[PDB]
């Protein structure tokens, strides 16, 4: 097999790339090219040929339960071997990662971009026919919730042709023609959804903040947990048009609420959802995690006010590990040499003020450090 590489586009989905390779190189459709690829990997006896996917909806390494590394090895082999000129294959693939978004959400990665798994579309991938007809390839962005309008054409993305037969470019191709009715698909205008889409695509879109892409998706994920429902594009842009006082109001309303409803006060009692919901969006880089950065700034300045209400709030060993990004052994190790003064991992032995100062004294990194909110 010697394939001709189609013209590269950095924002192309892996599926669209394989469809264009199949088209350019004379294969009937992408499924026939995948079967032929699997057959070639067998002919050269490639250790993972047997698990190479023939279903275009399962081609990404995240779709492989246990053969994800055989999958990436096959992509590297193909990109290095079967082409006139090496293509960027690995760079288009969506991989699992072990990173997380607080409190408990897993993640995927494409190139250097990390996404919360909650936003990864589970069923039918929408498209923009204007992009398909105009450019001839599909965008990786269509795979992720929150990007609901095309940032280039400003129209909602489409899931279904007018005939109720859902259109999925992975199975029904890159021209934007309906399978069943054989008609080209048509569209169906919120300003707030457009801003978010342009922002998630990586472009400056005021009043949304200029953060690395992984942290933009983190903010979508964070707002969904704050609003406790699917992403509300309107109130999200409204939130950042009044930033930072909009967030200072969320913090102040929250602590006042819990004070109304004293030595027993735990950090989770006063600020539970807010604090542990913000730690990893996806990491504690305070230049980029502006939620955690603003929260720590607000807490540092209110530390000893009101007879130390903030500083005396009680914490677990478990919660101190999530704050400091250390292990449980190190907590017990600091207890013994009396670096940290209070074993029981669930007992609320420690004070936020001590944990905060310990962070400053022993656990600041080049990213997780107070200088970014100063
Ligand atoms: Zn478009
Ligand atoms: Zn139709």
Residue numbers in the entry: 1 to 188, 193 to 265, 270 to 350, 360 to 391
Q: What's written in the study?
A:
To complement the available functional studies, our efforts have focused on structural studies of the Vibrio cholerae Tn6677 multi-subunit type I-F CascadecrRNA–TniQ complex, whereby transposition subunit TniQ initiates DNA transposition with the eventual help of other transposition-associated proteins TnsA, TnsB and TnsC in the gene cluster. Here we report cryo-EM structures of a V. cholerae type I-F CascadecrRNA in complex with transposition subunit TniQ before (binary CascadecrRNA–TniQ) and after (ternary CascadecrRNA–TniQ–dsDNA) target double-stranded DNA (dsDNA) binding at an average resolution of 2.9 Å and 3.2 Å, respectively.
We also determined the crystal structure of apo-TniQ at 2.1 Å resolution, demonstrating that TniQ forms a head-to-tail dimer with a dimeric interface of 1931 Å2. Superposition of the TniQ dimer in the cryo-EM structure of ternary CascadecrRNA–TniQ–dsDNA complex (in color) with the crystal structure of the apo-form (in grey) reveals minimal conformational changes with an RMSD of 1.19 Å; the loop interacting with Cas6 becomes ordered and the helix interacting with Cas7.1 undergoes slight movement (circled in green).
